[PDB]
């Protein structure tokens, strides 16, 4: 189906102990492929997927230059936003940025994003039309007015619907063996006992992409009254999730677990 | 590839 490319940036100020910590990661769908860490010795953009390693040295020089430029921009912005919020030098503060694009199965542009945060809360976001901004507070109004009148916002729009889509197409073709795959979940149920009461855990393991839906149902009725854990990485590119429900004993076949995943032909139903 | 040629806040 559709595909996405995302870049994530975190800049954390370090009052009195040097420059801020800066970490950048790039994702294609749910697969990370690049990273930069200002505390690492290389001081280069580094590959994190096999298919990106085949890019030549000009790619890595360009990516290293632009990631350091992003880092310097956020370092300047940390000092600027500190003044906007009338904060002191003593405290630590964080700027987070996410941006990217989505493409359809045809590879055509679907949407673009650019969202900025300060200390874990929305600061400014690009609207869906890629030519207007939503500012979350009064300090962000200053940035919004600056960026509304900035010719650089025209190039950002051209990157998100243009350049971003083109690079994503190139990555998808180069990583066709892995990025285009879809691993169905391996499902099973476990039983764990007071008396006349137990827990049924419905497992889903080794699936890609991360999107999945697990639901418990009693007598065909949705049972959202259940414990759902957050989808977690297995460490090998696949993901895990489980849903558990408390069951009075003897009622084991009243309960059904339903697994929805794009790697499944039809949604699975599980009975203990 | 990364976006480039941006501006300050």
């Amino acid at each position, epitope marked *: 189906g559709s595909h996405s490319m995302r870049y994530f940036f975190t800049s954390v100020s370090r009052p009195g102990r040097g420059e801020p910590r800066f970490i950048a990661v790039g994702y294609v769908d749910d697969t990370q492929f690049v990273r930069f860490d200002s505390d690492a010795a290389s001081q280069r953009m580094e590959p994190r997927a096999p298919w990106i390693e085949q890019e030549g040295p000009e790619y890595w020089d360009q990516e290293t230059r632009n990631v350091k430029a992003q880092s310097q921009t956020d370092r300047v912005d940390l000092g600027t936003l500190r003044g906007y919020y009338n904060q002191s030098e003593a405290g630590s503060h964080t700027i987070q940025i996410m941006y990217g694009c989505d493409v359809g199965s045809d590879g055509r542009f679907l949407r673009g994003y650019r969202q900025d945060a300060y200390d874990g809360k929305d600061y400014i976001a690009l609207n869906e039309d890629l030519r207007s901004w939503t500012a979350a507070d009064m300090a962000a109004q200053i940035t919004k007015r600056k960026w509304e009148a900035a010719h650089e916002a025209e190039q950002l729009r051209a*990157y998100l619907d243009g350049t971003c889509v083109e690079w994503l197409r190139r990555y998808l073709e180069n990583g066709k063996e892995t990025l285009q795959r879809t691993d169905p979940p391996k499902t099973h149920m476990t039983h764990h006992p007071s008396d006349h009461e137990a827990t049924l855990r419905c497992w889903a393991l080794g699936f890609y992409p991360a999107e999945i839906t697990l639901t418990w149902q009693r007598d065909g009725e949705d049972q959202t009254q259940t414990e759902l854990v957050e989808t977690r990485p297995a460490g090998d590119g696949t993901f895990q999730k489980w849903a558990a429900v408390v069951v009075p004993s003897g009622e084991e076949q009243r309960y059904t677990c339903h697994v929805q995943h794009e790697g499944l032909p039809k949604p699975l139903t599980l009975r203990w | 590839a990364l976006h*480039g040629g941006w501006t*300050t806040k």
Partner: T-cell receptor
Amino acid sequence: AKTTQPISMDSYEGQEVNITCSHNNIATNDYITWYQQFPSQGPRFIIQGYKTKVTNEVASLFIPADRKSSTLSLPRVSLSDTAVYYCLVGGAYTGGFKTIFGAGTRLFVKA
Amino acid sequence: AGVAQSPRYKIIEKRQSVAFWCNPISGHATLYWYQQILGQGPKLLIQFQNNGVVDDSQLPKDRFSAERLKGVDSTLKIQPAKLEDSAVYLCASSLVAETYEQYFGPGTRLTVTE
């Protein structure tokens, strides 16, 4: 060098001066930037744009829809505006990283 | 305060050395060295991002060398100068990178006589 602009231009003081620069191989991530260099001085930034016409107190920069050219417009030139005007095209990508000033346009203002 | 450069004028003889110095605007991450020979526009010699060299394509490395070791001020050296080295050498800096405004220093005028 993506840019071609006239070698020199003559104008009388008080006239509007328009300098057109041709860059038909402009890329998506390219900006159009103009610099002005007075004698015995280094170049000085005057304006940068992407698509939309940009105006400041020094000049205006007009860019057509196809971005294949651009025109720097000096509103009302004085004798002190005699300088070299460079049209630059580049951006934050491998094919545009290097700054290339070129020969520029030598504007001479006559009294 | 803008970009500072040193020296302003220099006269030397073919096959001897000279060292230009530059101090950019405080906090600027990118530093540029330009050579401008008479009748032509500036030509980029070397570009620094932080303390690392980022553009060397047009540097005549047999004679031209430059260092910005701590990422603030840079020194450009010519050894040994040739007759064609007579030019104005300009230093510039930008807050982030090449798409930003490049603030230029006063420049260094170098004449290399026989």
